[PDB]
Design a protein around this ligand. Structure first.
Ligand SMILES: Cc1cc2nc3c(=O)[nH]c(=O)nc-3n(C[C@H](O)[C@H](O)[C@H](O)COP(=O)(O)O)c2cc1C
Ligand code: SF4
Ligand code: SF4
Ligand code: SF4
Ligand code: FES
Ligand code: FES
Ligand code: NA
Lengths: 44, 214, 430, 264
């Protein structure tokens, strides 16, 4: 049985300014190829 | 107070130096690839947020760079930067203190926290300390109302505060230490103080109560 | 049954609500997440939508629309455009903090809920829009998403089901209006968080102009359990048409402000006393409750005695369930100043797009500020009532409606308190 | 033929194409719905809410400019709910609007003045102070007095779609939302002067024309432009034997509703 008396969500005390966008960069390899609208943009 | 027209100054003009570091350019192309091809104006909010995490704030040159990197018109980047309140169009302190004063917090004495911070730092809300280490502002609900009163300082939440607790956190930041997010009352997150009234039993494990035929 | 409450831990869904177990995949597996997901997926869209329809689950974002009907608007043949599920994690209603706990302690419930819900709609990816201020929660959610990608649970060939699904996290930048379902879509697309008019509906024209369903985190997170344990099990709680369990935030003047999961249609009195430790100073010290978050009107102590916390019961009380965020004010509270600070919030949150809320909510805010001091005359109370009725029903989005209702709740139940201040202010100067 | 569908405007049958809006169905019976943000040659915006109209047996009024008509709908353009919606919306528009009509060039040809006369209340119950915003300098042709702006976004949609200039937008939000360029910048398209016509209020006015005339004075002479070979149809406004200004004259097959800044 788990201890269930301490707090087990303490990893976030060590996060920094770029934690979110580093995971996003790391996650790019797993993504599936995006769909295309057919144009480079709606032409701005 | 906080205007929504830009007027050039020596410290904030189109020639104020800004660029993304090479590391951050790798992070941009990961952001852009999250969206369908031909729909990369969707990347403005994250990329604009990244420019501020690199820089601390957004001069007009940083907004102009975001527009060029994404090839969106600058006015479309300006519209975003002035709409969302987390973009700092003026420089902020090292520690941006944001005190919630919406009603659930106000009922639990967010006014006392705001008063203590003013007298401790010797500034008013909306101002920066002369050494430029704290900026103090009031904000709307931060989604932590059961842990009221609470403040956000950069990316961290400090919760279940009292005037004595907030003074400690200010002392730690002046020293150079990181205080530690979370409640300062004895509980760990959102549990009722004085013991759990629910989820006192062990979790029931895989497969429990599964419907037949699944 | 006619009595509701006293939910058992075996029936609770969010078993790591308080973060006392591991929130990563190893813990989530032990607690029963990601179990037989491949079986659920291969049973198909129609079966999954059948379970949600049978369960009678309703929206947890505030509006309480039947989830199974809403998710079935996507159950149509594609037209060459991609299909998307957006998970609304903006959670910006004052008093509400329930979605925050799901993301930081049960992130793998949400990720699986994205896949099961995304599959039922026939979607290719999920975009989770989380408010920017929830930085640590957003990073917990990305760690969980990476673990699911590494374990093969999402991405190419999800759970070995020959079905591809992506789960992207996009962060907001500080706007309560971006929790409105179409303002959220615009914010994803890189624009100001200004809601769209309807029609078109998102299931027709949504994010990037594609079929989209916006769903609340709590709605999405409980879906895998409804499929595993069945819609009949979930429908066994709460009154008919108001079924299931629910996360409640109790804040304000209670002894033990907390988040707790409880059965629907639980009495409001029982919920405060059992879990929150009762009103600060005793039940007789209660003045008023806002039962559904800021947007729902307050009710007085007399109504709170017998009212059940479910969608229909609170409609008969002239309020609403909303986000099930209970805010408590005891008799020491300045009721006028409390509601005035809520109008001040809505004035700071209006997107400004449409005239009645851009101008009206700012107008109501100024009159309320004068009501706090008593610097008005009682003829203005009916004027403020009419102004709020001119906003309500006349705006693009429900923010304008949610700004009018708090004013109406105060005028309906505490008119003597307002008129008393005006009398004191007049004599304090005359 | 087979695609035409039956709707009713105050009980009168109209056959309309699929996609026709409630505002357009009323046009076919000769009933003009009040509007501010809607302009037929711009993308639908639906933000002013002056076009709210009751549909029989539906409890929520619909924005006529944006709502497609459904089969069998009976649009009650003069019902009490329609009328009270218009009064409420007009009251919101006039709350922060400046008491500028004597000094404002729009006076006498103003859609805010006129739709207030025809659809609004006759008095004010607003007992507060008013908003006031600073003015933007966008060049020698268009004067801006943005305290008069009603946030209709017609200028933004004209600049983006008709002129292809993505330099106008909104900054801020709530009651503090401001139409402009954010930075100091000039609006100098060859079509730029058309924002003066389509701005419903005196927020955007002609610098050369400023203060010289009132619209009831002017005699209108319908004529043609010779500054190019397009042959745009114009109105030449004169007073007491002097030319005062040039306005576009609608011609669907030449200039539609617009003229160039040289023509203007
Ligand atoms: C001003 C405003 C804010 C809203 N904020 C949220 C929010 O923070 N989270 C949420 O799930 N819904 C929010 N909603 C409701 C959504 O528009 C939408 O109904 C819901 O997210 C999706 O439907 P669902 O609850 O059935 O899942 C908001 C609505 C308005 C008008
Ligand atoms: S009601 Fe308010 S928030 Fe909603 S679209 Fe209108 S102005 Fe924007
Ligand atoms: S825009 Fe119209 S209502 Fe406003 S000041 Fe000018 S003439 Fe008067
Ligand atoms: S300046 Fe005129 S056209 Fe532009 S938004 Fe304001 S009122 Fe509308
Ligand atoms: S009211 Fe302060 S965090 Fe919600
Ligand atoms: S004309 Fe329809 S809302 Fe403006
Ligand atoms: Na004009």
């Amino acid at each position: 049985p788990t201890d269930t008396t301490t707090y087990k969500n303490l990893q976030h005390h060590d996060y920094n300014t770029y934690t979110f966008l580093d995971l996003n960069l790391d996650l790019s390899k797993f993504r599936l190829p995006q769909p295309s609208s057919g144009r480079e943009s709606p032409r701005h | 107070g906080a205007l929504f027209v830009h007027r050039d100054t020596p410290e904030n003009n189109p020639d104020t130096p800004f660029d993304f570091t090479p590391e951050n350019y790798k992070r941009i192309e990961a952001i852009v690839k999250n969206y369908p091809e031909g729909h990369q104006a969707a990347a403005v909010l994250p990329v604009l947020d990244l420019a501020q995490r690199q820089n601390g704030w957004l001069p007009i040159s940083a907004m102009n760079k975001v527009a060029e990197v994404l090839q969106v018109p600058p006015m479309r980047v300006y519209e975003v930067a002035t709409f969302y309140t987390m973009y700092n169009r003026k420089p902020v302190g090292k520690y941006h203190i944001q005190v919630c004063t919406t009603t659930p917090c106000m009922l639990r004495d967010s006014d006392s926290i705001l008063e203590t911070l003013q007298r401790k730092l010797g500034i008013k809300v909306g101002e920066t300390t002369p050494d430029k280490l704290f900026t103090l502002i009031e904000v709307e609900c931060l989604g932590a109302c059961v842990n009221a009163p609470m403040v956000q300082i950069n990316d961290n939440y400090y919760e279940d505060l009292t005037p004595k607790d907030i003074e400690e956190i200010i002392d730690e930041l002046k020293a150079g230490k990181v205080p530690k997010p979370g409640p300062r009352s004895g509980r760990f997150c959102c549990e009722p103080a004085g013991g759990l009234t629910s989820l006192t039993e062990p979790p029931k494990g895989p497969g429990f109560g599964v419907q037949a035929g699944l | 049954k006619t009595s509701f409450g006293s939910l058992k831990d075996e029936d609770r869904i969010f078993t790591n609500l308080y973060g006392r177990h591991d929130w990563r995949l190893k813990g989530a597996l032990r607690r029963g997440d990601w179990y037989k997901t491949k079986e659920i997926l291969l049973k198909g869209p129609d079966w999954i939508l059948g379970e949600m329809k049978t369960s009678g689950l309703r929206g947890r974002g505030g509006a309480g629309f039947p989830t199974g009907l809403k998710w079935s608007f996507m159950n149509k043949p594609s037209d060459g455009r991609p299909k998307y599920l957006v998970v609304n994690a903006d959670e910006g209603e004052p008093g509400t903090c329930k979605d925050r706990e799901i993301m930081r302690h049960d992130p793998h419930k949400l990720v699986e809920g994205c896949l099961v819900g995304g599959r039922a709609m026939g979607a290719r990816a999920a975009y989770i829009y989380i408010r920017g201020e929830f930085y640590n929660e957003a990073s917990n959610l990305q760690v969980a998403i990476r673990e699911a990608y590494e374990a093969g649970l999402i991405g190419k060939n999800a759970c070995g089901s020959d079905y591809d699904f992506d789960v992207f996290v996009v962060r907001g930048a500080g706007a309560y209006i971006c929790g409105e379902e179409t303002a959220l879509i615009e914010s994803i697309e890189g624009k100001q968080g200004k809601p769209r008019l309807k029609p078109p509906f998102p299931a027709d024209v949504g994010v990037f102009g594609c079929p989209t369903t916006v769903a609340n985190v709590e709605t999405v997170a409980v879906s895998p359990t409804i499929c595993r344990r069945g819609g009949t099990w979930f429908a066994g709680f709460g009154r008919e048409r108001n079924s299931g369990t629910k996360l409640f935030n109790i804040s304000g003047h209670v002894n033990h402000p907390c988040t707790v999961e409880e059965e629907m249609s639980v009495p409001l009195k029982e919920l405060i006393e059992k879990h929150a430790g009762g009103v600060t100073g005793g039940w007789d010290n209660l003045l008023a409750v806002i039962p559904g978050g800021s947007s729902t009107p307050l009710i007085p102590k007399s109504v709170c005695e017998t009212v059940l916390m479910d969608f229909d019961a609170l409609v008969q009380a002239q309020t609403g369930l909303g986000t099930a965020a209970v805010i408590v004010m005891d008799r020491s509270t300045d009721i006028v100043k409390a509601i005035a600070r809520l109008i001040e919030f809505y004035k700071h949150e209006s997107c400004g797009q449409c005239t009645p809320c851009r101008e009206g909510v700012d107008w109501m805010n100024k009159v309320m500020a004068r009501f706090v001091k008593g610097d008005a005359r009682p003829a203005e109370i009916d004027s403020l009532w009419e102004i709020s009725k001119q906003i309500e029903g006349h705006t693009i989005c429900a923010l304008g409606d949610g700004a009018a209702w708090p004013v109406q709740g105060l005028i309906r139940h505490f008119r003597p308190e307002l008129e008393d201040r005006m009398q004191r202010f007049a004599q304090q100067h005359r | 033929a087979s695609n035409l569908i039956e709707v009713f405007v105050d009980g009168q049958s109209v056959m309309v194409e699929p996609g026709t809006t409630v505002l357009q169905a009323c046009e076919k019976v000769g009933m003009q719905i009040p509007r501010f943000c809607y302009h037929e040659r711009l993308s639908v915006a639906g933000n002013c809410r002056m076009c709210l109209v009751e549909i029989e047996k539906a409890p929520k009024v619909v924005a006529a400019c944006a709502m497609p008509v459904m089969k069998g709908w009976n649009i009650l353009t003069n019902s009490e709910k329609s009328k009270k919606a218009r009064e409420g919306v007009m009251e919101f528009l006039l709350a922060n609007h400046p008491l500028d009509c004597p000094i404002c060039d729009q006076g006498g040809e103003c859609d805010l003045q006129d739709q207030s006369m025809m659809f609004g209340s006759d008095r004010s119950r607003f007992l507060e102070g008013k908003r006031a915003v600073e003015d933007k300098n966008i060049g020698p042709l268009v004067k801006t007095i943005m305290t008069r702006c009603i946030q209709c976004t017609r200028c933004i949609r004209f600049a983006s779609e008709i002129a292809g200039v993505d330099d106008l937008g909104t900054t801020g939000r709530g009651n503090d939302m401001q139409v402009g360029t954010y930075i100091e910048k000039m609006f100098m398209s060859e079509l730029s002067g058309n924002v003066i016509d389509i701005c419903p209020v005196g927020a955007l006015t002609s610098k050369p024309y400023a203060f010289t005339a009132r619209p009831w004075e002017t005699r209108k002479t319908e004529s043609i432009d010779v500054m190019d070979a397009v042959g745009s149809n114009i109105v030449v406004s004169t007073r007491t034997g002097e030319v005062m200004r040039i306005l576009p004259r609608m011609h669907e097959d030449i200039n539609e509703e617009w003229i160039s800044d040289k023509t203007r």
